[PDB]
Design a protein around this ligand. Sequence first.
Ligand code: ZN
Ligand code: ZN
Ligand code: ZN
Ligand code: ZN
Lengths: 1179, 69, 116
Amino acid sequence: FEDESAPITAEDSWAVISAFFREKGLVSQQLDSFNQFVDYTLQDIICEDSTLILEQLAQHTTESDNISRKYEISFGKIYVTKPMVNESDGVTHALYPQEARLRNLTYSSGLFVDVKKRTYEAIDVPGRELKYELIAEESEGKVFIGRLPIMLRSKNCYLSEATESDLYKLKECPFDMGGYFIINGSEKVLIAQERSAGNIVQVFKKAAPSPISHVAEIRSALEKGSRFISTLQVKLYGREGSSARTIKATLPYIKQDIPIVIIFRALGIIPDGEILEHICYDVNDWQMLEMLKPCVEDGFVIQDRETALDFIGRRGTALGIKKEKRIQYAKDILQKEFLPHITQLEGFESRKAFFLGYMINRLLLCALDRKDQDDRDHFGKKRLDLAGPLLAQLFKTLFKKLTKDIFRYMQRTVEEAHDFNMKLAINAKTITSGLKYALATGNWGERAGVSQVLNRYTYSSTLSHLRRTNTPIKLAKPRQLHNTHWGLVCPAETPEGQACGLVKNLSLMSCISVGTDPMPIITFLSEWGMEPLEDYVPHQSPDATRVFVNGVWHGVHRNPARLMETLRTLRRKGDINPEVSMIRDIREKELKIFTDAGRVYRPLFIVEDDESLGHKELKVRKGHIAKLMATEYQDIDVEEYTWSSLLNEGLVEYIDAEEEESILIAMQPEDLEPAEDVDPAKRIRVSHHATTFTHCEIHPSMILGVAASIIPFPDHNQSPRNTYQSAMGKQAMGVFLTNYNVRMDTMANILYYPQKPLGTTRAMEYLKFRELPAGQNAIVAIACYSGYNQEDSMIMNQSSIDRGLFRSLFFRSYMDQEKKYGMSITETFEKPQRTNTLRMKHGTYDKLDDDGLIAPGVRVSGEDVIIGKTTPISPDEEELGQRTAYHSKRDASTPLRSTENGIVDQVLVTTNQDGLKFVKVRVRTTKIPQIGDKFASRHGQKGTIGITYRREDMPFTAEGIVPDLIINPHAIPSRMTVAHLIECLLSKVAALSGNEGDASPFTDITVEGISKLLREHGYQSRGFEVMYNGHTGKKLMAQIFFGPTYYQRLRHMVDDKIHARARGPMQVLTRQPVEGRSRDGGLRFGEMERDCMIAHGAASFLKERLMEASDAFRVHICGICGLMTVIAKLNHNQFECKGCDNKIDIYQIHIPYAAKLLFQELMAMNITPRLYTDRSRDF
Amino acid sequence: MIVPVRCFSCGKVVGDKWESYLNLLQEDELDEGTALSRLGLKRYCCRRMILTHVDLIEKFLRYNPLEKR
Amino acid sequence: TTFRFCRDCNNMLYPREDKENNRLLFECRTCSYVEEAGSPLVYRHELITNIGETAGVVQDIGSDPTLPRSDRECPKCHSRENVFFQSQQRRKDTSMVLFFVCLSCSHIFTSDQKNK
DNA sequence: ATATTGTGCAAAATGACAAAG
RNA sequence: CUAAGAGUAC
DNA sequence: CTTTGTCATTTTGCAGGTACTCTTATTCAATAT
Ligand SMILES: [Zn+2]
Ligand SMILES: [Zn+2]
Ligand SMILES: [Zn+2]
Ligand SMILES: [Zn+2]
């Protein structure tokens, strides 16, 4: 406050958090990854390779034409425009997302590339080296190669710079956060795909039966190259008791596990001592030397680099190399396939030998029991591929396809001497269709579910979907919540199904790095004293720290403390990109630096000595908080102070799981920084008795995700209840966007009267939950009132329902196009007439007017036609009794859903990309809560309505207050949802006093204080109230827990689930009832239902279920051959089995049609299931 | 969306107190509890009816009318 | 075991029997370099290994903020402050005895009792 | 201008292979 | 209509 | 000389039950009649 350098309090950190969410937003990672892809990755993809050279040799039979031509095509800079749409008439205009959504277009922008076509000629003189020269035809000329879909709010989108008023003008909700694509009018979101990081050596113990005990492997990969995965493995043969423990490496394109010493000698290290120095860095570590002796004894037979290269080449799986060139072949394999991530050039054999020695050293350390096998679940060893890298690799493949097509076309046209045209060379449809297919359907190629339809049921649902990570599914246990997941993914938010643990959600303050070029950091290291790896001799520098950058051992340092200090200083002042992570392992004497993309990190406060106060203190003080407050208030004149200002001045730091291994974090500043009668109501906390902190948590409540941040008092609940609420709040019904009235979504649900919670958390005002609430504050009583709320049922107040509690709007949109079956076979929107139309639906067409669309305002019920469409067919056909040449049109109308009804809200007519007219009809109805609808508190206390009582029948307090809901007491004890009770108490206090209850998790708010405040208001301190029975007016012997509570209306309503079927449509193949209530299907009578009926012993009922209720088919067989090959003319009363030549040995049997189909499929597969009606053997 | 006409629990008419409530909060700089008491909302059912309302209709009013006369 | 290497071609040296003097003699297997054996020991195998428990001790081990501190007596400085950690030998049957490094003198002392 | 064709158990089974007469 | 995929309820 | 039991590979078939909703896509392109 008054003092500028005073230490901050736990209340101040929220200002910091606000600044963060001002600069970043909720979907910062999506936009950042896409912007990185568009700004830099496209150009790298284009420039890599993509120089098609075609050397048309002279092929000179006579020397008169001894000229060799060389046609090359190169690609220059790439230009990406603003999103625009073509048209049927050819006019091209700017496309805005709330036109792409309505017209089923693709929010995509064209890509152009500067193509330079060079041609060289040389004089084809045999023996003389060819010299190529230009012909001065240096033609260059941007060409359209396809369209890149643009994610909304990205740097290339129209909405990136839009203000709130502009967003309102463009029919865009200002609360919409972007981070998604519009493909064919559908919002598609890319789920972050989790994978294991590359260029990291991992050592694993193998199972007992296998002859190899330990395996050290690296999944080498290079970002700036072909991006190919080569897995090197170093394996230790022999169990612990075995004597011949020899280490063998598995080189790519090699059929055998070459001994390591042979590789070392091949790279150029002949002496045994030098190899052992490369592997073992300590002379005193004689155990490792003893374990390593078998390898050199194995490779004693080779004592020359050329000999070892020949040995490897002999094992070469190519088997297309002559004896003398095997050496070169081996060299090539060691240069371009062995450890690609280090280098693809030559002259770095020493580096690769050092890296191999390092891997062997790690393997031997694991085998010597000096270190545990690497944890596969450590989150620092994982990476998340966001939209950026996914589109990067997809576009790399697709552009490689396109350039291969270009080269093939050029070769074909030069061979056939035809003219060359760029427009006929480039097929933009390749890139466009590839990207559109990959984004429209989840399958990411030519994996699945990589792109998903964005969830728009509720605002929090969309926020959670936009921060979702999926792990494709070894001997690990990925489903467990790891220790390293702290502060990076939500501890409690995951599906309960098969995906439990595999599908994760980001923490509120967690971000994914987009990747930076490591060259500046390498230059810094070289300048600051990093000894190059080439002239590194371990004996003269035993206690040297190995420096790794992106998994590439670049050298060693002799004073790592100073190097780490200066690197930290550089990163804290912004010279190094803050996303760069730097870890120093003192015990292993290693220094790792990671700058690649996909690393997940969170921000933390920095703590330094602060000699003025004589003890550790946060770098942030009250002055910075004051400046942040001033900037925030100005936004709602002084110098702007943003989160980036905190980052640049070294106030906050970005830490990932790997760096988090080497730091100590204080949970809260006010209690853990200062050196050391207590309230019994407060929870017990430990001071940790340690003062060497390096960082402080900005706020512990930030470990939760978007969905978990809505829970009030999540630390007073059983964790599975938190997980249930996290899963169930996405099904909460609220207001998903403020512009729902201009969007033609397939389904939309809206509350009439959303209410912000009485008990609210501090983190939910960054999630806009108070602006777009998804529930209501219902007056809840916990009572065994009538027994109709047992087993999770609830009693809802009918009078509250009558007055608008939990009422809802529901919108459904039906889309329909007219398609060109031929050049002049256009479909037509119209009102079909029974006189000249076929297969007109049994519903009423009377509500359509003459354009084939109902007009908004008309009430529609189930099976009524809302879109009238007809398709032309070939005339002059007579059948069916009433089919004539007049019936040239077949009905293609769209009826309303069979069960649904409502008012046609709106209808929208437009044209598609092809120029054909199409329509969208949105119908509106009202969902009023009733018996069977599902409601849930914010603590996993789900339940359906058992019954509804009017106000006069509900219990009432002395003030006449009656509950909106009554829930059973028995739901409380077993589930241990204490937070539910605490939130009810806090809500009662807040409603009485007019404040808002602060239900944040890790605050010092106790039930004692809430009870005292409630007592001051004149009520019983524990929330109990004397209630009276509604029926008789007598006092209830027991006092009732009573108060407001926030409840969500869930999407599961009984009217969308009730379904019955006497008889209906049958499946065409099996003649069994169809599947699904949308098709009037039948219920599955599964195997174990049959087993239960068997156990009951009711045979006739089982037969009736399987035959009369599903499919009973009468078939004819003959007594000679049990096959169904009997021709039966029932009207003529003639039965005959050809082959057997009989006409009186026939029987009829009633068998399931599926059984007849099975027997026919057996016969078609050359098996005779002969059926016989009498016994030939005794039992 | 817009202030409810009646309190859900008891049925007291609170749809005519939204503008007065906002006026009390803004012009008179009263805290929420005193304003609610001044308007006559004594039972906490009515108090939560008016205190927790979110007036989304304002946002809806920012978009240009679809059918403008 | 204290292995040694040839000083001619930097290759391993192996034990050899001698007849004239009946003595152990280390010889090279490729260039025939010969010398005397310092000790008669030629092979060691540790079923129960005691080394490696204090591995990774460096002069700047105190700069690690993750390592816990203690005020226990240093029996070379009598200083209070020091860092401590459990045995680094990751065998599942190792004892939980603690090791301490004085941040002033860098003397490693254990909390064991039978050894003392 | 359009039709036609370029995954982790874990039991079972099986094969290779040092010892035995 | 068929197929594939995704999300979800108990 | 052929067993003979014996390990180390190869197959190889499986992997809860119901139920709901939505979305996309049905071989691309070159050639010849
Ligand atoms: Zn027959
Ligand atoms: Zn009321
Ligand atoms: Zn030698
Ligand atoms: Zn000491």
